[PDB]
Amino acid sequence: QSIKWQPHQQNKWATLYDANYKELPMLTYRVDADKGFNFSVGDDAFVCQKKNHFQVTVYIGMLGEPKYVKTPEGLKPLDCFYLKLHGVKLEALNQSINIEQSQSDRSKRPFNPVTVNLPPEQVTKVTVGRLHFSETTANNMRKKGKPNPDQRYFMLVVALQAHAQNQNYTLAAQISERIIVRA
């Protein structure tokens, strides 16, 4: 059993256009959490340890060659692609949880969107490892032998972005099921 995903805000995505200003076929997108998440039967939810890093692998099939990003303000020239990860609070979906990446020396840096090169007519694989939620979830402690009635959760958002004239546009995004983060 592994983390399940669904599309996230699919009606709010920008689309990619080729050199002839014709819409490209929708790129394929698959998100998988390789490690860091174990399903806990008692909690009926996935659990991840803050000190134990998690890893996410993404498969992006670039169909055709993209040149423009279809934005709300018209077709704009494509600059580059970004892979962005962040957590959201299950009970406050507008609040984000920062993701940190741990280095060789046990130090951690904020995980900013990573540039990704997507050559045309290929499936590009991107593996993002050594990741950490910057926060723990509230109300993890069990009360009796029962799960905390106010147990909070995070959900992980993995989004491909296109950068066009000093702005980013989500082309595809998946959000995970609920996750408990303990320390």
Swiss-Prot record:
Residues 1-183 bind DNA. Changing residue 182 to A: Decreased affinity for DNA. Changing residue 106 to A: Decreased affinity for DNA. A motif (Nuclear localization signal) lies at residues 143-146. It is found in: Nucleus; Cytoplasm. Transcription factor that specifically activates expression of myelin genes such as MBP, MOG, MAG, DUSP15 and PLP1 during oligodendrocyte (OL) maturation, thereby playing a central role in oligodendrocyte maturation and CNS myelination. Specifically recognizes and binds DNA sequence 5'-CTGGYAC-3' in the regulatory regions of myelin-specific genes and directly activates their expression. The nuclear localization signals mediate translocation to the nucleus. This is Myelin regulatory factor, N-terminal. It comes from Homo sapiens (Human). The gene is MYRF.
